[PDB]
């Protein structure tokens, strides 16, 4: 299917957007975000509507849609 675009909001209000498929395991987004922030992936927690995003969660499982927001907090 089509890519959807998700907005990842950092603790400093910065944003990095990601295009993912509905079947993409979100570990791939977590790893890329952590790489671009220059921090270990295990130092961060990623939330969708306040709930923790697991490595093997997909946008389909979480009910995500185009332009949904993920927030990043310190673990």
């Amino acid at each position: 299917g089509e890519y959807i675009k998700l907005k990842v909001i950092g603790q400093d209000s910065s944003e990095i957007h990601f295009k993912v498929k509905m079947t993409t395991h979100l570990k791939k987004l977590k790893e890329s975000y952590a790489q671009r922030q220059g921090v270990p992936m295990n130092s961060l927690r990623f939330l969708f509507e306040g709930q923790r995003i697991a490595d093997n969660h997909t946008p389909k499982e979480l009910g995500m849609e185009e332009e949904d927001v993920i927030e990043v907090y310190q673990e």
Partner: peptide, 15 residues
Amino acid sequence: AEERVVVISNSSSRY
């Protein structure tokens, strides 16, 4: 900041 959008995407082996 500028907009940032990231796209998340053996027989040749010799080692």
